[PDB]
């Protein structure tokens, strides 16, 4: 319809603003990983858990890979 | 910090109301904020001074 | 989406290894996220916003401390996020310190 | 106590206290050390919060 | 003996260290006035057994 294209325009907008927020804090996320985490926030997730997961997997790819 | 302090001190010694103390203290601030490297046109000089401060601690290593 | 196929993509983004390579990492991700899938704190995006202020005060990048308010206004104006508090909490938790020589594209 | 700056007026020896900015994962302690030196009462009209913020920048440099 | 002497002392020492940690936990929320904490462990012992018991969110 029309509101089915307005929502995709809004997600392309919000991911670009969140990318600015992620880069000025010097986080490891980029445009592709940030979308995974936003899709996770749609279902509802504790970010206290998600950040510890990402904090482990980055150390488990600089010690295993 | 000495000429600005002189500029402040004479204006507070002559201050015949509170507004002179305020309006002199703000000028005393606004010259220190510009003679020190704290503007956004002098930002490059700050970054270069950070490089100086980094080569100092590099020398100890 | 659906979370069980979605967490697999997170294991594929961070690690360079595919999902047909390793299975202990997916199980550790299910260990944490499964049974800790509910926010244990309730939302206040204001408190985490005023600590990104204090981080840009900490870096003397306080021209960008006023740029951040325009990034925070936008997030409320679109309203396509379920929680605007959660992603800010994620990005602050994943912070570092890129002090010395600003760069911003603002939009 | 160690320095001889303990014979001053008791007010100014009370006005200073260490003010943290915040805690960050990874930052040396020097940038997250700053004195408060807040003052209230009728004196607060000369020296508001806005004064101490610009002074935080100058103390920082 | 051991059941009339030692085991009760071991139980008591355990419980007393436990109550010590509970009181120091309930006093860490309370901060001059922090010198109750400083006086209680002047040498500094039974305040570095563990910072807080670990968990995960």
Residue A24 CA: distances (Å) to CA of A42, C22, C96, C98, C106: 24, 33, 10, 8, 10
d(C-alpha A53, C-alpha A40), whole Å: 13
d(C-alpha B12, C-alpha B18), whole Å: 9
Q: Assess C36–E contact: CB distance below 8 Å, yes or no.
A: yes
Sign of CA dihedral C36, C43, A29, A5: positive
d(C-alpha D32, C-alpha C31), whole Å: 36
Which residues does a gap of C–N over 2.5 Å follow in chain D? none
Q: For residue A28, what is the DSSP state?
A: S
Per the CB < 8 A criterion, the answer to whether E1 and E27 are in contact is no
Per the CB < 8 A criterion, the answer to whether C96 and A27 are in contact is yes
Task: Determine how many CB atoms are found less than 10 A away from the CB of residue E46.
Answer: 13
d(C-alpha B19, C-alpha D42), whole Å: 13
Token pair of D57, please?
A: 């920048």
Residue A14 to chain E, least CA–CA distance (Å): 27
Per the CB < 8 A criterion, the answer to whether D46 and D32 are in contact is no
d(C-alpha E50, C-alpha E21), whole Å: 10
Comparing CA positions, the residue from A29, B56, B3, B25 lying closest to residue D43 is: B25
Comparing CA positions, the residue from A10, A26, A18 lying closest to residue C72 is: A18
Instruction: Give backbone dihedrals phi and psi of C72, rounded to 5 degrees, phi first.
Output: -85, -30
d(C-alpha A38, C-alpha B56), whole Å: 43
d(C-alpha E7, C-alpha D50), whole Å: 64
d(C-alpha E57, C-alpha E51), whole Å: 18
Comparing CA positions, the residue from A55, E56, A37, E51 lying closest to residue C40 is: E56
d(C-alpha C93, C-alpha C75), whole Å: 19
Comparing CA positions, the residue from E43, C36, D25, D39 lying closest to residue A26 is: D25
Comparing CA positions, the residue from C87, C56, C55 lying closest to residue C74 is: C87
Residues of B with CB under 8 A from a CB of C: 38, 40, 43, 47, 50
The H-or-E segment that residue D34 falls in is strand D34-35
Comparing CA positions, the residue from A37, A44, A45, A4 lying closest to residue A18 is: A37
Instruction: Give backbone dihedrals phi and psi of B50, rounded to 5 degrees, phi first.
Output: -65, -40
**Helices and strands per DSSP (H, E), number in chain C:** 5, 0
Instruction: Give backbone dihedrals phi and psi of D35, rounded to 5 degrees, phi first.
Output: -75, 155
**Residue reference for tokens 């010198």:** E35
Instruction: Give backbone dihedrals phi and psi of D9, rounded to 5 degrees, phi first.
Output: -65, 140
Q: Which long-range contacts (CB under 8 A, 24 or more apart) does D28-32 make?
A: D31/C58, D31/C99, D31/D60, D32/C58
Per the CB < 8 A criterion, the answer to whether D24 and D32 are in contact is yes
Helix axes A47-57, C3-14, angle to 10 degrees: 40
Comparing CA positions, the residue from A41, B46, D57 lying closest to residue C89 is: A41
Token pair of E14, please?
A: 């355990």
Token pair of A36, please?
A: 């995974």
Per the CB < 8 A criterion, the answer to whether D55 and B28 are in contact is no
d(C-alpha C63, C-alpha D14), whole Å: 33
**Helices and strands per DSSP (H, E), number in chain D:** 2, 2
Task: Determine how many CB atoms are found less than 10 A away from the CB of residue A26.
Answer: 13
d(C-alpha B7, C-alpha B36), whole Å: 17
Residue D11 to chain C, least CA–CA distance (Å): 29
Q: Do chains E and D touch (3 or more CB pairs under 8 A)?
A: no
Q: Assess D57–C contact: CB distance below 8 Å, yes or no.
A: yes
Write the DSSP assignment of E5-26 as a string of letters. Answer: THHHHHHHHHHHHHHHHHHHHH
CB pair distance less than 8 Å for A53 and C16: no
**Angle value at C-alpha C64, between C58 and C66, nearest 5 degrees:** 105
Experimental structure resolution, Å: 8.7
d(C-alpha D8, C-alpha D17), whole Å: 16
Q: For residue D41, what is the DSSP state?
A: G
CB pair distance less than 8 Å for C102 and B50: no
CB pair distance less than 8 Å for B33 and D54: yes
Comparing CA positions, the residue from C63, C83, C97 lying closest to residue A37 is: C83
Residue C77 CA: distances (Å) to CA of A13, C49, C63, C74, C84: 11, 16, 23, 5, 11
Give Cα A55 to chain centroid, integer Å: 14
d(C-alpha E2, C-alpha D23), whole Å: 51
Instruction: Give backbone dihedrals phi and psi of C82, rounded to 5 degrees, phi first.
Output: -65, -45
Neighboring chain B residues of D58 at a CB cutoff of 8 Å = 29, 32-33, 36, 38
d(C-alpha E29, C-alpha E25), whole Å: 7
d(C-alpha C81, C-alpha B60), whole Å: 49
Token pair of A41, please?
A: 């926030």
Residue B49 CA: distances (Å) to CA of B45, C56, D39, E33: 6, 19, 33, 43
d(C-alpha E24, C-alpha E47), whole Å: 8
Residue C99 CA: distances (Å) to CA of B27, C58, C94, E5: 30, 9, 15, 63
CB pair distance less than 8 Å for D32 and C58: yes
Gyration radius (Cα) of chain D, Å: 14
Cα dihedral: C70, C72, C73, C77 (round 10): 130
d(C-alpha A51, C-alpha D36), whole Å: 33
Neighboring chain D residues of C55 at a CB cutoff of 8 Å = 22, 24
CB pair distance less than 8 Å for A47 and C93: yes
Neighboring chain A residues of C33 at a CB cutoff of 8 Å = 45, 49-50, 53
Token pair of D33, please?
A: 């050390």
């Amino acid at each position: 319809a029309a509101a089915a294209a307005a929502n995709l325009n809004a997600v392309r907008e919000t991911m670009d603003v969140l990318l600015e927020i992620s880069r000025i804090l010097n986080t490891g996320l980029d445009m592709e990983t940030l979308s995974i985490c936003v899709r996770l926030c749609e279902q509802g997730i504790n970010p206290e858990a998600l950040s510890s997961v990402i904090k482990e997997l980055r150390k488990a790819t600089e010690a295993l890979k | 910090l000495e000429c600005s302090w002189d500029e402040l001190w004479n204006k507070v010694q002559q201050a015949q109301d509170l507004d002179h103390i305020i309006a002199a203290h703000e000028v005393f601030l606004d010259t220190i904020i510009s003679r020190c490297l704290l503007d956004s046109d002098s930002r490059a000089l700050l970054n270069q001074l950070r490089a100086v401060f980094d080569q100092i601690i590099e020398l100890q290593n | 989406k659906s979370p069980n196929v979605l967490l697999q993509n997170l294991c594929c983004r961070i690690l360079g290894r595919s999902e047909a390579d390793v299975a202990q990492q997916f199980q550790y991700a299910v260990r944490v996220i499964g049974s800790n899938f509910a926010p244990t704190v309730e939302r206040d995006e204001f408190l985490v916003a005023e600590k990104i202020k204090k981080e840009l005060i900490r870096q003397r990048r306080e021209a960008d401390a006023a740029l951040f308010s325009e990034l925070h206004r936008k997030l409320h104006s679109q309203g396509v996020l379920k929680n605007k508090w959660s992603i800010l909490y994620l990005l602050l938790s994943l912070s570092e310190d890129p002090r010395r020589q600003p760069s911003k594209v603002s939009s | 106590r160690a320095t001889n700056a303990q014979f001053d007026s008791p007010e100014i020896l009370r006005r200073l206290d260490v003010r943290l900015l915040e805690v960050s994962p990874g930052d040396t302690g020097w940038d997250v050390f700053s004195l408060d030196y807040h003052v209230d009462g009728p004196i607060a009209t000369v020296f508001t919060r806005e004064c101490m913020s610009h002074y935080l920048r100058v103390f920082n440099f | 003996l051991v059941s009339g002497f030692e085991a009760t002392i071991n139980k008591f020492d355990k419980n007393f260290s436990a109550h010590l940690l509970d009181l120091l936990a309930r006093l860490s929320i309370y901060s001059g006035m922090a010198s109750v904490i400083s006086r209680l462990d002047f040498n500094g012992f039974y305040t570095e057994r563990l910072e807080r018991l670990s968990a995960e969110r």
